[PDB]
Amino acid sequence: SGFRKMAFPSGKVEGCMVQVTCGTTTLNGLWLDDTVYCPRHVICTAEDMLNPNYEDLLIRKSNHSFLVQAGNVQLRVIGHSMQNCLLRLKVDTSNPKTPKYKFVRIQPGQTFSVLACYNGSPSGVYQCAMRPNHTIKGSFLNGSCGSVGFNIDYDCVSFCYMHHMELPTGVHAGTDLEGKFYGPFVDRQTAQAAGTDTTITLNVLAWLYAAVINGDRWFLNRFTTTLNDFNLVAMKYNYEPLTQDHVDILGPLSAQTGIAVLDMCAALKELLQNGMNGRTILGSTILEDEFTPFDVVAQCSGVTFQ
Known part of the structure; x- marks a missing residue:
C-alpha cells in the first residue's frame, strides 16, 4: 500500500x-x-x-x-x-x-501546493513545506524538473517556487519565480547536499501515527522513554532532536490513537536501534520522513478545526 x-x-x-x-x-x-x-x-x-x-x-x-x-x-x-x-x-x-497571478518569495515553515508532473503531464497537486535548510521533501518531485509551487487566495495564484533539482539526499532545491534559489544551492553539478540528510523526526512520528490509524501495530511496544533519552538516540542516528513544541504538535494524533507521544518515541527508538528486519510499515521497508503531521491529519483525521 x-x-x-x-x-x-x-x-x-x-x-x-x-x-x-x-x-x-x-x-x-x-x-x-x-x-x-x-x-x-x-x-x-x-x-x-x-x-x-x-x-x-x-x-x-x-x-x-x-x-x-x-x-x-x-x-x-x-x-x-x-x-x-x-x-x-x-x-x-x-x-x-x-x-490572475503574482510572484512571491516565501520562507521556511510556509506551506504551498506543487503541481507534480510525470513525463511532462500534470499528475496531481500536493502540499509541500520548505524546511529550514530550504529544501523540500516530496517523492512526487522525483524524476521531474521545472514543476511549480503556489498558493491560492480567492482568485489570485501566488507562484512561489520552481523546482530545479533533486539532491542525492532525496530532497529538492528550487528558486522563486524571479529565478533566485532558496538556500545556498546552485544550478551546476557539484556536492551541495551537506546539511540536507538529517531525518525529520516530527514527520517520522507523524507517519508512524498514520500507520497505526491504518492498522499497523507490530512496531508498538509496552515501553516508554524520556525526551532526553530519546534525543540521545535520535542524534546518534542523525535525526532532528524532538522539542516539547513538537510533542505538542503531535497531540491531536496522540489523542486520536490513544498512544502517548513518548510511547511512540519508544517504538521509534527500537526501530532505529534494531531496524525493521524486512518488515513493512504502510507499505514501506524504511522509515518515511516526507509526510508532516498536517499531511497525516489531512488524509487520516477526517475534519480538522481551526
Missing part, C-alpha cells in the same frame, strides 16, 4: 504547464500570457553542467534552439533572455487561461 497525500486545488495551474526542450534536454515550464519560464539549466549538455558559464552558453543559442510544447501544440519562441537562474521565453501566442 503506502501513505497517500491529500489532493489540493490546482487553481487552473495545470493549464499553464508546458515543456521546454533544448538540445536533448526536456523539462517543465510555466506559461503565463506570452511568456514561458523554466530552469536555465535546460541549455546545458551533461558536460556543461560540471562548470557552466551560462552567459557564454546562451549566446550560442537562438530562438529556434528552444522547442516549447503545450501538449500536442507548439508555442513558437520569439524571444529569449536569462533572469537569474531562469530562462524567460517569449512565445507567439498567449495562454488563453492565464489566471
Whole structure:
C-alpha cells in the first residue's frame, strides 16, 4: 500500500504547464500570457553542467534552439533572455487561461501546493513545506524538473517556487519565480547536499501515527522513554532532536490513537536501534520522513478545526 497525500486545488495551474526542450534536454515550464519560464539549466549538455558559464552558453543559442510544447501544440519562441537562474521565453501566442497571478518569495515553515508532473503531464497537486535548510521533501518531485509551487487566495495564484533539482539526499532545491534559489544551492553539478540528510523526526512520528490509524501495530511496544533519552538516540542516528513544541504538535494524533507521544518515541527508538528486519510499515521497508503531521491529519483525521 503506502501513505497517500491529500489532493489540493490546482487553481487552473495545470493549464499553464508546458515543456521546454533544448538540445536533448526536456523539462517543465510555466506559461503565463506570452511568456514561458523554466530552469536555465535546460541549455546545458551533461558536460556543461560540471562548470557552466551560462552567459557564454546562451549566446550560442537562438530562438529556434528552444522547442516549447503545450501538449500536442507548439508555442513558437520569439524571444529569449536569462533572469537569474531562469530562462524567460517569449512565445507567439498567449495562454488563453492565464489566471490572475503574482510572484512571491516565501520562507521556511510556509506551506504551498506543487503541481507534480510525470513525463511532462500534470499528475496531481500536493502540499509541500520548505524546511529550514530550504529544501523540500516530496517523492512526487522525483524524476521531474521545472514543476511549480503556489498558493491560492480567492482568485489570485501566488507562484512561489520552481523546482530545479533533486539532491542525492532525496530532497529538492528550487528558486522563486524571479529565478533566485532558496538556500545556498546552485544550478551546476557539484556536492551541495551537506546539511540536507538529517531525518525529520516530527514527520517520522507523524507517519508512524498514520500507520497505526491504518492498522499497523507490530512496531508498538509496552515501553516508554524520556525526551532526553530519546534525543540521545535520535542524534546518534542523525535525526532532528524532538522539542516539547513538537510533542505538542503531535497531540491531536496522540489523542486520536490513544498512544502517548513518548510511547511512540519508544517504538521509534527500537526501530532505529534494531531496524525493521524486512518488515513493512504502510507499505514501506524504511522509515518515511516526507509526510508532516498536517499531511497525516489531512488524509487520516477526517475534519480538522481551526
